[PDB]
Design a protein around this ligand. Structure first.
Ligand SMILES: COc1ccc(S(=O)(=O)N(CC(C)C)C[C@@H](O)[C@H](Cc2ccccc2)NC(=O)O[C@H]2CC[C@@H]3C[C@H]4CO[C@@H](C)[C@@]42O3)cc1
Ligand SMILES: [Cl-]
Ligand SMILES: [Cl-]
Lengths: 99, 99
């Protein structure tokens, strides 16, 4: 699809058996999802943005369906106000910015 | 151009006669620039990101060249870690997300 930016680029994602809405975010290096339960080992990480830093749990090798496209990568879980699909997964679905 | 996302989508901007580097950020509603002096009166705004809220100064009808494309619009100035080009200006240069 071609997504215009008059509105937030929100899509439906499937992760950990749950459906969620998430923002396609070219400004995010990594993918950050609100507090949920995921299987496997995790390690703690601090990530920073506007306002400062939050502590997240880093899960590796997570499968996520983004607008019907399967992709795998690291997912950070923590108290983010919005679910964010970052560049580490946008590349896997072949997303580009065009102008 | 067509910009893939294996690297941060950084571009050169020209604002107030200075060259700066900025991130093309589909996850940002508005454009946020580091501390500088800009012309005119400003209004207050409170914006929230991943790590809380910051106070910024809102300047309207500012001329900004983004990767050679002229835009004229609202710029927020404050303690952001990186210069961010948000959707308010991405729409002016015709940017879309494609996959
Ligand atoms: C290592 O991995 C990562 C991954 C993600 C982040 S990040 O999340 O800190 N960040 C990074 C950039 C700010 C440099 C990604 C960036 O796209 C971020 C995502 C977002 C959107 C909503 C809520 C929370 C986060 N946008 C945003 O802060 O926008 C703000 C600021 C501009 C206007 C004013 C606000 C109104 O509400 C939001 C939409 C805002 O739009 C950092 C590190
Ligand atoms: Cl990854
Ligand atoms: Cl590619």
């Amino acid at each position: 699809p071609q997504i215009t930016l008059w509105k937030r680029p929100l899509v439906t994602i499937k992760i950990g058996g749950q459906l969620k809405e998430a923002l396609l975010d070219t400004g995010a290096d990594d993918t950050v999802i609100e507090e949920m339960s995921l299987p496997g080992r995790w390690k703690p990480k601090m990530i920073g943005g506007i306002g400062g830093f939050i502590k997240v749990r880093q899960y590796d090798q997570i499968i996520i369906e983004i607008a019907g496209h399967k992709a795998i990568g690291t997912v950070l879980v923590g108290p983010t106000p919005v679910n964010i699909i970052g560049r580490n997964l946008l590349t896997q679905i072949g997303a580009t910015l065009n102008f």
